[PDB]
Design a protein around this ligand. Structure first.
Ligand SMILES: CCCCCCCCCCCCCCCCCC(=O)OC[C@H](COP(=O)([O-])OCC(O)COP(=O)([O-])OC[C@@H](COC(=O)CCCCCCCCCCCCCCCCC)OC(=O)CCCCCCCCCCCCCCCCC)OC(=O)CCCCCCCCCCCCCCCCC
Ligand SMILES: CCCCCCCCCCCCCCCCCC(=O)OC[C@H](COP(=O)([O-])OCC[N+](C)(C)C)OC(=O)CCCCCCCCCCCCCCCCC
Ligand SMILES: CCCCCCCCCCCCCC(=O)SCCNC(=O)CCNC(=O)[C@@H](O)C(C)(C)COP(=O)(O)O
Ligand code: SF4
Ligand code: SF4
Ligand SMILES: [Zn+2]
Lengths: 178, 114, 113, 45, 96, 49, 206, 99, 208
């Protein structure tokens, strides 16, 4: 079905009262006055402005922020150097090198994420089979040089150690959906 | 070995179109140097135009010559109507790019690229 | 009555839609008689034009004529008829009833490679 | 356990207005012309 | 644990450290080379060996779906504990 | 009326930040003088309302 | 999905239609308000961008990204809706038509806006068809065409809505068409909220 | 929502609309930020029998396109046809045909 | 019936097959192949000489009325003699249908432009020329539309590298934005994501 947005049906003819109403509308600027009144109502409303940085906009546990590498509760790294995140990364922002550790464990020797190349899509955290790489909810990590956004394994493990109290709670609140 | 022509039946009128395009470039070079504030002289611009034509001078296929003329006319129009900027015009000179030497000893000292 | 507007921008109302469709269809048939007898385009266009001319001669009312034609507004039908006439002229010039001009290469339409 | 999912309430959601709703306000043209003419006459006097 | 080079630079858990004559320490001049202090190899060495009764144990890292994929470790060798290939936890069969 | 109630809320917002010094501190740091329930305070000294 | 010969589950299709209509509201908000900003009025831009912020909150709550969700995927959607999202969508949509009425009061009957938009950029229907226009341009020129009605996809054949059609082919008619199809998108949003079915999220094909 | 009745009446008169019924600021009607855990349902293929993949392999039912005529394979009174029946005219809306 | 498989209607396939026969017998001079996909889409593969008559017939015929060109594009398959497959997707609002018309070209045989048939073909053919190097005869103004000014090469070709040959940077000695031969700090790592096992037996090509 369809409807007309501007087509008028029949005519209203001509009347002295209607002509006087249109004359008053043209001369006394009635629609302009009611536009003024609308802006006046908005003036006397309450603004929708939060007091940043003391107030923050609401988010969800699903929010994709700064990357981090998590651990098991024992303290062992969750990552097993399987390169699924590297394979699924649409921007090729992940570089992984690996070798057996001194105890024979399958661990990374290089895990780099170019955050200037990353598109913050969460494909790494949804392809990780052991929940090692995550996008924790940090978003206020802007730097002053281009280099500081080239994360390596030490930076990502430090982020995982810093944000574990929040990332674990978000994964607890979210993991039944995924 | 028999193909459909684009514009030229053989090489003669293809070379005629090449000469017309070279004439248009030769006339347009001083206007470009005056309009875009170019450091180069009029002699250098015409030398560059001649260098580009002589770079393409080795072809003997009329269709390829016609397509080269079409491309040259497109670039000529991009220079006539000021769509190429000073950077786009000066990209023909490669003045910031050091040239790779053509001798075996220098290529041996530089790296593994032949 | 008379249609106030066609509902489309730039499409003026035709005061006499029946005779305009009649003359367009007759001119189309007259130029279709110049086509070769074995031309499939001639046969199909004659079928379409004859059916539309038959219903435009049968129905004198514009609304029921539009319902029979199923081509939107009768002004759209007139526009389609004159475009068909121009296409008939162009196709007579082009002569596409001739055999295939050139075979494609063997793997031109082979997908996947 | 029971399947828990994001679903509408069993009674459905309430009606959502979507039509254009202008208040159709203001006084008549005769009344405002009369007010203006009366202001003119009083000011002239 | 974090060890220092003869240059004084911290050695990472991958064993990476720049040499004394390596020019790339100038990126750490007037800045810091940050090294993750908690070494996962030492942390997983600190875990006690889980003493189970069955010949085959199942490990998922704990937390169920929050852990690693569930694998089965065969504790037949009495001279060596069975290590989970994902989480690094060690298990030993109790034969008493 | 309600204007006097708004003025009561305003004077309690003014005299609800400790003293004049506390009011000036919160007004020139946060640009806000709203009174909220103290949810907590972290180990670094941030107060949460 | 057409290349794969697979179909998403009905709950996924309903979610996709609901978020398509939310996205249509977002895009028409941007179009109308930034058009009005280019004309010279910015207060509808500010109001409707607060509304855009609320819809971005919906996007972040379903996907974790406010704009580039990567949520709708071949086979359905990435995740199920979190609990309470449908209630919050209802709470947003039950108040939104007033905001549209606010912008319409600000602009539609304004003689300045009518002078700026009426008989500007008039496109005839035949010219629009030949130039290959689609969507708002054709319907502003008066062509009764909408892909959701003619070649429907997902559950657009199950929802019910009207198609705004212009009659003069100008900026004013296109603006009216965009506002009216914002209202129709709100209508479809109400239908999707009432008729959201239970079930899975991706196609059951690993 | 903290506006006085005088300011509320002023805003409602100035806008022409009852603004207090539909506020653009969310106060309490929204969902709680903490929710009970869900339990998502499983799809139709989550069954332990009569669920062979060859019977639901839609991806492998794709066939190469059927050649209606070919210049090499075929080596080549009926009515004229259309790609489809002509599109039915849209009915005017019974809800609100005109603005 | 099956919840994971797309439903299939045979009426659209029958109608498109009938219309393909119709167009093929109307224009035997140019039509080389007519096919209907299992996705119910009609494709007509024609000789490059018949682009103008075929497009004009499809736009202006009473039973076709494909008055809207959906898009015009090219596909580079560099294993045939005519590597560029030019594709026209067209929409008929009168009959609520879509058709696809294909033709072929190589680097040195231009095809006729259809700007005189559809005006959108102007920018579409500009894009095709800019991205593939397929010249178009009788174009009103053919030039680049998406590449940079003075860009050499047609980047949507298969043999053109993904990163290109030049990159821009601001040089302070000349105070300009200059073009250099491309050097990457990290090379694009190509992946061999092809299973060595056949996935679709219906598309098994016979051995050579
Ligand atoms: C003339 C009107 C002056 C303003 C006024 O009386 O507003 C009250 C009140 C404002 O109504 P409202 O818009 O509902 O108030 C917003 C909230 O409802 C209520 O707001 P709230 O609850 O978020 O907090 C309100 C609180 C906020 O308190 C403060 O901001 C205190 C600041 C102290 C700084 C030291 O108190 C006030 O705003 C009291 C009025 C202050 C007026 C100051 C005028 C001088 C400004 C400086 C000049 C130099 O006015 C009226 O209701 C009638 C106005 C006309 C009166 C004649
Ligand atoms: C001056 C006005 C400033 C703004 C006042 C508040 C705006 C909102 C009022 C309510 C509203 O929306 O009304 C819409 C309504 C219009 O609604 P409408 O658009 O539906 O029109 C009513 C219907 N007809 C067409 C028949 C009139 O406004 C009016 O009714 C009055 C508008 C005209 C009178 C005011 C403007 C001309 C004044 C000239 C003399 C100067 C006065 C003194 C100035 C002193 C200070 C400098
Ligand atoms: C400011 C600077 C801007 C510079 C802009 C440069 C524009 C570049 C335009 C390039 C146009 C062409 O490449 S057309 C030239 C190619 N055509 C041919 O080679 C035709 C065949 N060649 C010949 O016949 C050649 O021998 C000669 C030298 C062209 C003619 O020699 P004749 O004597 O036997
Ligand atoms: S969020 Fe996406 S782009 Fe970023 S590292 Fe993960 S997979 Fe790569
Ligand atoms: S997907 Fe996870 S386990 Fe695999 S390499 Fe990446 S972070 Fe490590
Ligand atoms: Zn384990």
């Amino acid at each position: 079905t369809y409807k007309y947005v501007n087509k008028k049906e029949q005519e209203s003819e001509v009347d002295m009262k209607s002509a006087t109403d249109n004359a008053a509308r043209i001369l006394m600027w009635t629609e302009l006055i009611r536009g003024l009144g609308m802006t006046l109502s908005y003036l006397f409303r309450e603004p929708a402005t939060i007091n940043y940085p003391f107030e923050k906009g609401p988010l969800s546990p699903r929010f994709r922020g700064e990357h981090a590498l998590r651990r098991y509760p024992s303290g062992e790294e969750r990552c097993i150097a399987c390169k699924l995140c590297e394979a699924i990364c649409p921007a090729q922002a992940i570089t992984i090198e690996a070798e057996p550790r001194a105890d024979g464990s399958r661990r990374t020797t290089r895990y780099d994420i170019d955050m200037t190349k990353c598109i913050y899509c969460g494909f790494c955290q949804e392809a990780c089979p052991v929940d090692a790489i995550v996008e924790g909810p940090n978003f206020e990590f802007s730097t002053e040089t281009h280099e500081e956004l080239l994360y390596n394994k030490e930076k990502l493990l430090n982020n995982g150690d810093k944000w574990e109290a929040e990332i674990a709670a978000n994964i607890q609140a979210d993991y039944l959906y995924r | 070995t028999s193909v459909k022509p684009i514009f030229s039946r053989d090489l003669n009128e293809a070379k005629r179109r090449v000469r017309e395009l070279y004439r248009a470039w030769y006339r347009e070079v001083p206007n470009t140097v005056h309009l875009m504030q170019l450091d180069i002289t009029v002699k250098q611009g015409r030398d560059k135009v001649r260098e580009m034509f002589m770079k393409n001078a080795h072809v003997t296929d009329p269709r390829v010559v016609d397509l080269l003329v079409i491309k040259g006319k497109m670039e000529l129009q991009e220079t006539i109507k000021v769509w190429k900027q000073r950077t786009h015009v000066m990209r023909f000179f490669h003045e910031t790019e050091t040239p790779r030497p053509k001798d075996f000893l220098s290529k041996f000292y530089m790296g593994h690229d032949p | 009555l008379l249609k106030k507007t066609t509902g489309l921008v730039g499409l003026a109302v035709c005061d006499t839609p029946h005779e305009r469709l009649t003359i367009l269809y007759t001119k189309t048939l007259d130029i279709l008689k110049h086509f070769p007898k074995h031309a499939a385009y001639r046969k199909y266009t004659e079928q379409i034009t004859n059916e539309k001319l038959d219903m435009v001669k049968a129905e004198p009312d514009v609304k029921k004529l539009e319902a029979l034609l199923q081509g939107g507004e009768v002004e759209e039908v007139i526009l389609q008829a004159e475009k068909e006439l121009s296409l008939a002229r162009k196709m007579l010039k082009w002569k596409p009833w001739e055999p295939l001009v050139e075979e494609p290469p063997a793997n031109q339409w082979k997908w996947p490679i | 356990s029971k399947v828990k999912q994001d679903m509408p309430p069993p009674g459905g959601y309430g009606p959502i207005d979507y039509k254009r709703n202008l208040p159709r306000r203001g006084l008549s043209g005769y009344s405002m012309f009369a007010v203006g003419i009366g202001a003119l006459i009083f000011g002239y006097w | 644990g974090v060890q220092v080079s003869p240059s004084g630079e911290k050695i990472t858990h991958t064993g990476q450290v720049y040499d004394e004559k390596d020019y790339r320490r100038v990126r750490f001049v007037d800045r810091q080379k940050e090294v993750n202090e908690n070494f996962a190899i030492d942390l997983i060495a600190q875990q006690p060996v889980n003493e189970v009764e069955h010949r085959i144990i199942a490990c998922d890292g704990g937390g169920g779906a929050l852990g690693h994929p569930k694998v089965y470790i065969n504790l037949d060798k009495e001279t060596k504990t069975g290590t989970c290939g994902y989480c690094g936890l060690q298990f030993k069969q109790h034969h008493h | 009326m309600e204007l006097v109630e708004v003025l009561k809320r305003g004077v309690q917002q003014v005299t609800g930040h400790g003293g004049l010094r506390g009011l000036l501190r919160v007004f020139f740091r946060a640009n806000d003088i709203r009174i909220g329930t103290l949810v907590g305070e972290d180990k670094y000294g941030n107060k949460y309302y | 999905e057409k290349l794969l010969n697979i179909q998403p589950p009905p709950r996924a299709q309903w979610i996709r239609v609901l978020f398509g209509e939310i996205t249509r509201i977002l895009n028409h908000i941007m179009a109308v308000t930034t058009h009005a900003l280019d004309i010279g009025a910015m207060t509808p831009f500010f109001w409707m961008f607060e509304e855009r912020e609320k819809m971005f909150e919906f996007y972040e709550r379903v996907s974790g990204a406010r704009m580039h969700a990567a949520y709708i995927r071949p086979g359905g959607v990435h995740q199920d809706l979190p609990l309470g999202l449908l209630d919050d969508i209802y709470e947003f949509s039950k108040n939104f038509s007033l905001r549209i009425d606010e912008v319409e009061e600000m602009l539609t009957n304004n003689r300045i806006w009518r002078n700026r938009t009426v008989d500007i950029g008039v496109v005839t229907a035949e010219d629009a068809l030949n130039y290959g226009f689609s969507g708002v341009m054709l319907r502003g020129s008066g062509i009764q065409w909408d892909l959701r009605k003619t070649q429907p996809y997902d559950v657009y054949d199950q929802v019910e809505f009207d198609v705004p059609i212009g009659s003069r082919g100008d900026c004013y008619d296109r603006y009216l068409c965009r506002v009216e199809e914002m209202r129709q998108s709100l209508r479809i949003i109400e239908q999707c909220l009432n008729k959201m079915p239970p079930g899975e999220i991706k196609v059951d094909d690993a | 929502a903290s506006a006085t009745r005088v300011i509320q009446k002023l805003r409602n008169w100035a806008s022409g609309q009852d603004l207090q019924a539909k506020l653009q600021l969310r106060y309490q009607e929204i969902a709680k930020r903490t929710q009970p855990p869900p339990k998502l349902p499983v799809g139709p293929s989550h069954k332990l029998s009569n669920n062979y993949y060859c019977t639901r392999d839609g991806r492998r039912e794709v066939v190469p396109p059927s050649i209606i005529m070919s210049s090499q394979k075929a080596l080549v009174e009926k009515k004229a046809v259309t790609p489809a029946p002509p599109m039915k005219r849209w009915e005017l809306s019974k809800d609100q045909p005109y603005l | 019936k099956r919840p994971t498989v797309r439903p299939r209607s045979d009426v659209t396939h029958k109608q498109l097959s009938a219309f393909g026969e119709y167009v093929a017998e109307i224009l035997p001079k140019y039509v080389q192949q007519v096919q209907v996909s299992c996705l119910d889409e009609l494709e007509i593969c024609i000789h490059p000489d018949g682009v103008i008559p075929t497009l004009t017939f499809l736009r202006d015929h009473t039973n076709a009325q494909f008055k809207s060109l959906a898009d015009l594009t090219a596909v580079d398959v560099p294993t045939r003699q005519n590597r560029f497959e030019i594709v026209y997707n067209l929409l008929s609002l009168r009959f609520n249908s879509r058709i696809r018309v294909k033709t072929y070209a190589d680097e040195l045989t231009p095809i006729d432009s259809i700007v005189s048939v559809h005006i959108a073909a102007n920018w579409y053919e500009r894009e095709v020329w800019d991205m593939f190097g397929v010249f178009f005869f009788n174009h009103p103004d053919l030039r680049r539309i998406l590449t940079d000014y003075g860009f050499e090469g047609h980047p949507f070709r298969k043999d053109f590298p993904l990163t290109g040959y030049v990159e821009l940077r601001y040089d302070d000695e000349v105070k300009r934005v200059v073009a250099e031969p491309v050097e990457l700090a990290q090379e694009f790592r190509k992946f061999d994501l092809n299973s060595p096992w056949e996935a679709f037996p219906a598309y098994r090509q016979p051995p050579e």
